[PDB]
Amino acid sequence: PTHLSVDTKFKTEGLCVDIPGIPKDMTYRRLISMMGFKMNYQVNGYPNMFITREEAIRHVRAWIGFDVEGCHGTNLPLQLGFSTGVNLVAVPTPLMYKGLPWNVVRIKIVQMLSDTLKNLSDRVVFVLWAHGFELTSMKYFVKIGPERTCCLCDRRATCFSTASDTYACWHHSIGFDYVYNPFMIDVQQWGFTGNLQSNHDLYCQVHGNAHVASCDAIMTRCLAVHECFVKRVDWTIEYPIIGDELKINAACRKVQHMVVKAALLADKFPVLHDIGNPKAIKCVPQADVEWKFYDAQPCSDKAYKIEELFYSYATHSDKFTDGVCLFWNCNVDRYPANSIVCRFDTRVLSNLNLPGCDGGSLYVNKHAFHTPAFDKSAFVNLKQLPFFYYSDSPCESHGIDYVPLKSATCITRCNLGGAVCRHHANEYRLYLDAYNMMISAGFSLWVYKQFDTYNLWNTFT
Numbered sequence: 001p002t003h004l005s006v007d008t009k010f011k012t013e014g015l016c017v018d019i020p021g022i023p024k025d026m027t028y029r030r031l032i033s034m035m036g037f038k039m040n041y042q043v044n045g046y047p048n049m050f051i052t053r054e055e056a057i058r059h060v061r062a063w064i065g066f067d068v069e070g071c072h073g074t075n076l077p078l079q080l081g082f083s084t085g086v087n088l089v090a091v092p093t094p095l096m097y098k099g100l101p102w103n104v105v106r107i108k109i110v111q112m113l114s115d116t117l118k119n120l121s122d123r124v125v126f127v128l129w130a131h132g133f134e135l136t137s138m139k140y141f142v143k144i145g146p147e148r149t150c151c152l153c154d155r156r157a158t159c160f161s162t163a164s165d166t167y168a169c170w171h172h173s174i175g176f177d178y179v180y181n182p183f184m185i186d187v188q189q190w191g192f193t194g195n196l197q198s199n200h201d202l203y204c205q206v207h208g209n210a211h212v213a214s215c216d217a218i219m220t221r222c223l224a225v226h227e228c229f230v231k232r233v234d235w236t237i238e239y240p241i242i243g244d245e246l247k248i249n250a251a252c253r254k255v256q257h258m259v260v261k262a263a264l265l266a267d268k269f270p271v272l273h274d275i276g277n278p279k280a281i282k283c284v285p286q287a288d289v290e291w292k293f294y295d296a297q298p299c300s301d302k303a304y305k306i307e308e309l310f311y312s313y314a315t316h317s318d319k320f321t322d323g324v325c326l327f328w329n330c331n332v333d334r335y336p337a338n339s340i341v342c343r344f345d346t347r348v349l350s351n352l353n354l355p356g357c358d359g360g361s362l363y364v365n366k367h368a369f370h371t372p373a374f375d376k377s378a379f380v381n382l383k384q385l386p387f388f389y390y391s392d393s394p395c396e397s398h399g400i401d402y403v404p405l406k407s408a409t410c411i412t413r414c415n416l417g418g419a420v421c422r423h424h425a426n427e428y429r430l431y432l433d434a435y436n437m438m439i440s441a442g443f444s445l446w447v448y449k450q451f452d453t454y455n456l457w458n459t460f461t
């Protein structure tokens with residue numbers, strides 16, 4: 001069982017208000033036929049328009065919530081809402097657009113999906129809370145057939161043009177009018193009691209219901225993300241490389257060793273309390289410090305209460321007041337004052353970060369991590385960690401042309417002694433690039449208020 005069988009049953013109770021008299025017994029095969037799509041027995045890579053919950057999770061970057069509200073059935077106009085906040089009105093003659101015929105509506109749909117998805121996925125997954133009109137309207141903007149490649153490149157075809165009779169991916173679809181071979185999934189098939197708003201509002205206070213189709217489309221994708229990434233967590237699923245994943249991850253490792261090593265040199269803490277990843281390793285292996293590890297998986301729902309991390313039942317818990325605490329991506333409600341902290345800012349706009357549930361976001365870099373909403377108050381006992389570069393390594397070149405470096409934040413023997421050497425200038429600039437890579441990727445660094453880089457200069461005496 002790799003794909004969803006067309007002979008699987010589709011619960012139709014949710015479709016009987018827009019479609020009165022629909023059979024209770026219904027397969028995907030009969031539903032697709034009813035929707036106007038002739039699969040004509042095809043073994044060419046597109047076995048079903050609808051996908052499994054598992055296939056949907058592997059393709060989370062393609063998720064676009066879709067809702068159609070029957071505004072006034074090729075007799076009345078339809079309001080087409082997308083989780084992008086777009087509302088289009090199709091006529092059969094929070095961004096809201098006036099009534100227009102399908103021939104122009106379908107052009108806008110291709111433009112919008114292509115701009116949204118080109119840098120995220122090779123496909124679209126229409127996430128629905130199906131009531132009837134969204135499925136019966138797909139024949140107006142969707143064409144299906146064998147799997148294909150773009151006319152201008154080797155990527156999988158996601159759009160079709162009736163004007164030129166050619167196929168294109170999301171990058172080369174300008175002027176294309178049909179969505180080609182889309183995927184879709186009905187959230188109602190997962191067995192819910194009650195309507196969309198009641199199920200959504202159980203877990204999210206951030207998306208309201210302004211009664212437009214995009215509002216439902218957003219709430220639908222939000223509820224799907226909650227079910228698949230907040231309540232259900234699968235860290236085994238790997239996701240393709242689409243951006244700066246390898247550079248961002250390497251930068252995080254360089255930044256972590258740098259910041260922790262400098263803190264241990266500047267304030268000579270005897271013990272370090274490392275909380276978070278149960279698979280974490282000593283980021284500064286040569287440090288003198290007593291390195292103690294505490295297991296806490298990434299919290300995907302709400303941030304950990306600092307108090308519950310010490311709830312040791314009938315035994316005494318450790319005193320974190322001695323030494324320093326390292327919370328590298330361990331999201332707590334209020335950090336202790338003696339901490340070094342890396343906290344992902346969920347508000348960041350990027351191709352790695354997808355909108356999440358209740359203010360949080362779904363960070364997808366090798367794995368999907370739903371992260372709780374960023375909260376500035378978690379850092380009240382700390383300060384924003386300033387940029388600095390520290391190096392005790394020898395001033396030795398080993399060899400890109402050179403411009404002399406002048407910086408107050410290059411903490412080296414050469415800078416103390418008057419002039420930065422070529423090696424430390426190359427290393428400072430590389431470290432500044434990795435630092436900016438990680439900050440721009442959404443990460444934020446915080447440190448105990450007594451942290452001072454002035455204390456680092458005397459480690460050369």
Ligand SMILES: CNC(=O)c1cccc2cc[nH]c12
Nearest residue numbers: 294309310311312316317318
């Ligand atoms: C930081 N957390 C602790 O010191 C600790 C120590 C011993 C048991 C438990 C259970 C939860 N936390 C514990």
Ligand SMILES: [Zn+2]
Nearest residue numbers: 150153169172
């Ligand atoms: Zn292409």
Ligand SMILES: [Zn+2]
Nearest residue numbers: 204207222358
């Ligand atoms: Zn929501």
Ligand SMILES: [Zn+2]
Nearest residue numbers: 395414421424
């Ligand atoms: Zn030097």
